[PDB]
């Protein structure tokens, strides 16, 4: 698995590994989905929080508090993004507090690098870039406009989604955390990590779900097109992206530019009934390889479901954990021992018989802690500096 | 406040203390409301829990973990009840290892700490009945047959469903071989016997259905002399009930008027539809204080029948009530934290930055195991 890491990261574009789904690739896709789901588990969406839109966990406590292995990667940077055009009021979370940490920016994700122990298990010094999407579907997928605009910061022919590009490249000199656009905050950290581990074997892996999957895809093409995976000593490091429930990013020239990048491979996970991969409806093209799943075939989920349940990431990972194909007689059986309770972290999806509470990923008292006064204050974020 | 405890407990039926609302009685009503609210804060309503319908906190951890002062009272018994007629009222677990298929935690009894006695002015025994957070699932469909209560009186007619929960016993059940009535009465007697040489008071609290059960339970105590000690004393019985539906008919009220060691203060919110139940043939008992939570500039207007009914809005209403008159207004006379009204619902305005329904355990009881999986372990380790 560590010895086969190049093939698992798409060296041969996952040919022969998807139908039937290879067992080690099944684990591979899930573990990078866990790093993408970690962006959701740390993101404060409660507008009452004076840290709404920010990560509630510091970089040091990160993997432990999101329920993952803290021995494998080490978080090095949180990156933040802002916008400047009319967007659906669910892309950027805005605090109701007068002591708000920020009025322009949101936590867009985090970058981590494999530890020494993790490098043994992974097979190389892996640099992971995880982009945050949103939990909401109905609030944007049917109303967000999809104008095609150029991306000079990326390509200097290719046209790209106007909304995704604006979030990706908007700067603000009067802002506290987005004087540089989120793109550059990512690239500077990727460059210093590539420089830091230039004497080792290094891979770059981008993860994302929903809107984060579109930003991750554009980010992956961006890294490979501009040689940000090339070190100062002449090494080319491979760029790989595992994206989930991805809406389309660019047009035909964007696909054409993606095809020329020979050190880049994308694997998109697509749930049958999920309507988000349909977006945008005209003029856009997918890029990379695609694995199809159908969470409807799972006997654990509550039939019949809804568009939110077919879109969220933990159902996707549960679907990958048990997928046997999407054919009419494929069935469903868990090939990995992935806890089914994870599916209820942000929604009600499991059947009642499994006795898992709905929307259970929640801090104690939703961040309220009692004072010596006996009153209660919302203290929902770790003590760290931005 | 400790020297005036008899007046605050209704020695003179709170005459001269309700309008304008005396400040010591205002704090007094809120204090007993907090004890009633602890019945909701410890109750596991999540049907996914193996312990649905039971208390999530042990009696040892109770006051600290419900956010109250743990040096004033000390919990001495959890009591349980079951039913035998069709009635939401009883929470049923979906687990195949459910702690109980018949019973629910109906409330708790505590006794004044030594230091609590100095603060309260006497050794007060408190019995707190649990109600419900739901309204429209029963207030417009629950039948209200008038039935006798032989265990209570031996003429008064009382609500069929309330009496059935109050008196149903079940051999085969783990926790209700005795009805919930006898579980309360036995603990009350031994506490009266244990403190028969001191000043003792009995205070019953309750909200919603808990208020009706608390009303029936307080009348039951005074009528059968359960407040009487073996050394001849007759300790006063006081009931502070919130958002109470009615309990009995005119003979129930007539039997209440003859009990001169009993006093009941009902807190009634203007727009709350629950105090109208049942619609015909029933009568209120005790003294009444009217409030109007919709006069508060803190709550998101105009609210709904759930917002007008829950206990924490009631206590916030009492903390800031100036009367229900058109030009009365609203202003907090005590420093009660407004965030408490968002414990079980969304009520505050957005500007106050308090999350909705925030009373919740970490991960709603989920606990990660050493292998990375999660189990629902949402109850203290204690013996039922």
Residue numbers in the entry:
A (entry chain A): 4 to 159, 168 to 397
B (entry chain B): 4 to 90, 93 to 159, 168 to 397
Task: Quote the passages of the study that discuss this structure, keeping the authors' original sentences.
The phospholipases are classified into four groups according to the cleavage site; phospholipase A1 (PLA1) cleaves sn-1 acyl chain, phospholipase A2 (PLA2) cleaves sn-2 acyl chain, phospholipase C (PLC) cleaves before the phosphate, and phospholipase D (PLD) cleaves after the phosphate. Here, we report the first molecular structures of plant PLA1s: AtDSEL and CaPLA1 derived from Arabidopsis thaliana and Capsicum annuum, respectively. AtDSEL and CaPLA1 are divided into the following two domains: the α/β hydrolase domain containing the lid domain, GXSXG motif, and catalytic triad and the C-terminal domain containing the dimerization domain. In addition to the conserved α/β hydrolase scaffold, GXSXG motif, and catalytic triad, plant PLA1s have an extended C-terminal domain composed of approximately 70 residues.
CaPLA1 was selectively expressed in young roots of the hot pepper and hydrolyzed phospholipids at the sn-1 position. In the case of CaPLA1, there are four molecules in the asymmetric unit. Among the four molecules, two molecules make a homodimer; the other two molecules make homodimers with another symmetry mate, respectively. Each monomer of CaPLA1 has an overall structure similar to that of AtDSEL; α/β hydrolase domain and C-terminal domain are almost the same as each other. CaPLA1 also has two disconnected loops resulting from the disordered residues; Pro91 and Asp92 between β1 and β2 and from Asp160 to Phe167 between α6 and α7 could not be refined because of the deficient electron density map of the residues. The disordered residues from Asp160 to Phe167 affected the surrounding secondary structures; a pair of β-strands (β4 and β5 in the case of AtDSEL) were not found in CaPLA1. The AUC result of CaPLA1 also suggests that CaPLA1 makes homodimers in solution, considering that the molecular weight of the theoretical dimeric CaPLA1 and calculated from the AUC peak are 90.4 kDa and 86.0 kDa, respectively. The dimerization domain of CaPLA1 is similar to that of AtDSEL; however, more residues are involved in the dimerization. In CaPLA1, His376, Met379, and Trp387 of one monomer and Trp371 and Trp372 of the other monomer make hydrophobic interactions. Therefore, the dimeric interface of CaPLA1 is more robust than that of AtDSEL.
